[PDB]
Amino acid sequence: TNPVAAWKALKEGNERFVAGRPQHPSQSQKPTAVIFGCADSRVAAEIIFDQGLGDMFVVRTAGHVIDSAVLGSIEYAVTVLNVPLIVVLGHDSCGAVNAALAAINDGTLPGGYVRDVVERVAPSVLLGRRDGLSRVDEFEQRHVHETVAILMARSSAISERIAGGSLAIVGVTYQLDDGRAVLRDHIGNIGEE
Amino acid sequence: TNPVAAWKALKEGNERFVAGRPQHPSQSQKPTAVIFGCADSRVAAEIIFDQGLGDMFVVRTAGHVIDSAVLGSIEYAVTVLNVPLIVVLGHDSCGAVNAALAAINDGTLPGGYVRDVVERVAPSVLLGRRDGLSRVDEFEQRHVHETVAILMARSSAISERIAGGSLAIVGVTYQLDDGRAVLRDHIGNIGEE
Ligand SMILES: [Mg+2]
Ligand SMILES: [Mg+2]
Ligand SMILES: [Zn+2]
Ligand SMILES: [Zn+2]
Numbered sequence: 237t238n239p240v241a242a243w244k245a246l247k248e249g250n251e252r253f254v255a256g257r258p259q260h261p262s263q264s265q266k267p268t269a270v271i272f273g274c275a276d277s278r279v280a281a282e283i284i285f286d287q288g289l290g291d292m293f294v295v296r297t298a299g300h301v302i303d304s305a306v307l308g309s310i311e312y313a314v315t316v317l318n319v320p321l322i323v324v325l326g327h328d329s330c331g332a333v334n335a336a337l338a339a340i341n342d343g344t345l346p347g348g349y350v351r352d353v354v355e356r357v358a359p360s361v362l363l364g365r366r367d368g369l370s371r372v373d374e375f376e377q378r379h380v381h382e383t384v385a386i387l388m389a390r391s392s393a394i395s396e397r398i399a400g401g402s403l404a405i406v407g408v409t410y411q412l413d414d415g416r417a418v419l420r421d422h423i424g425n426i427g428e429e
Numbered sequence: 430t431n432p433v434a435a436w437k438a439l440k441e442g443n444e445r446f447v448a449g450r451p452q453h454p455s456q457s458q459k460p461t462a463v464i465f466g467c468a469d470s471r472v473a474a475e476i477i478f479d480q481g482l483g484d485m486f487v488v489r490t491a492g493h494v495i496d497s498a499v500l501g502s503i504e505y506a507v508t509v510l511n512v513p514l515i516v517v518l519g520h521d522s523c524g525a526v527n528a529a530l531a532a533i534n535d536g537t538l539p540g541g542y543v544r545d546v547v548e549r550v551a552p553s554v555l556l557g558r559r560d561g562l563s564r565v566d567e568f569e570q571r572h573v574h575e576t577v578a579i580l581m582a583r584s585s586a587i588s589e590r591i592a593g594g595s596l597a598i599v600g601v602t603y604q605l606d607d608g609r610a611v612l613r614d615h616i617g618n619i620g621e622e
Binding site for chain 1 (some may be wrong): 451454455456460468469470471472473475476484486487488489490491494495496497498499500501502504505506508509510524525528539540541542543544545546549583585586603605617
């Protein structure tokens with residue numbers, strides 16, 4: 237019902253997952269959070285954060301790429317379903333980011349609608365390279381950061397609710413082999429204090 | 430490695446889920462299938478089909494709406510990752526479909542990027558109404574059907590691989606309270622014979 241309670245639920249759920257003591261095995265009302273994840277993730281966010289049925293509204297694309305339908309999906313959860321928290325969720329060994337890194341090397345983009353994915357991931361890799369980054373996971377962390385920024389800049393409905401106090405957005409990553417959800421970016425009050 | 434083996438894996442996995450005897454509790458290589466699902470689904474496809482880690486490449490938007498990034502995501506799995514099967518996965522009590530039905534009644538679309546979602550779901554509801562449909566689940570089944578058609582029409586890379594023998598696309602629905610994955614549409618050879 238607010239960003240503090242929503243983030244508390246996810247943080248505790250990931251503590252239970254990491255501990256190997258889940259409350260909602262195979263997931264055992266209106267959603268607590270929007271999760272914006274990557275299509276090549278190897279594990280469901282509902283497992284990572286140990287949530288039950290209907291707790292999460294989940295949007296997923298290759299490399300977290302955003303177009304109008306992706307944006308409208310997230311805006312729908314916030315404005316229609318009144319969801320109080322958006323989590324941009326990144327992961328280790330992201331293949332989409334590796335594909336973007338490959339295209340930059342070769343100086344040309346792939347064809348068809350695959351172009352549309354790589355051209356939306358490549359800007360973050362280029363910013364990353366300007367700042368001295370060189371590894372897929374470093375680029376993915378930067379791309380999570382940039383994706384949070386894109387969502388606020390492109391959607392007045394999102395940005396207004398964050399300013400107004402009823403929405404927060406966080407950038408979070410995990411490494412599959414350790415399971416910990418690492419909080420990176422946080423815009424709005426989520427009760428960390 | 431081909432659409433027959435891919436569909437066999439999913440069908441058997443859903444039989445194990447329904448039976449209450451899963452091999453991959455909390456999900457216990459290159460993906461076996463693309464799943465295109467709805468963001469307001471209440472349960473992960475990895476549970477419904479009892480799959481392990483990395484087995485599924487999952488794209489999700491509100492109401493299965495398609496834009497360039499969604500399409501490119503699916504095309505990426507097929508052309509880069511050589512995934513042999515796309516599953517358009519629908520579900521009961523879909524809120525996005527109910528939101529589209531509401532907008533049609535009122536004769537005007539919602540604002541911001543929410544417009545972009547409802548205007549991509551509304552065409553299926555209108556076709557549904559022309560054919561005498563009236564319930565959310567009937568409209569969702571029709572919308573699964575239309576979404577399979579859209580993917581083939583909009584992507585030459587997808588359509589060519591289906592014609593060529595290396596890709597199939599299926600439309601599947603489930604009702605949460607019974608768990609069964611119901612096969613509705615099937616383009617290509619998936620070994621049902
Ligand atoms: Mg902060
Ligand atoms: Mg057929
Ligand atoms: Zn990824
Ligand atoms: Zn739905």
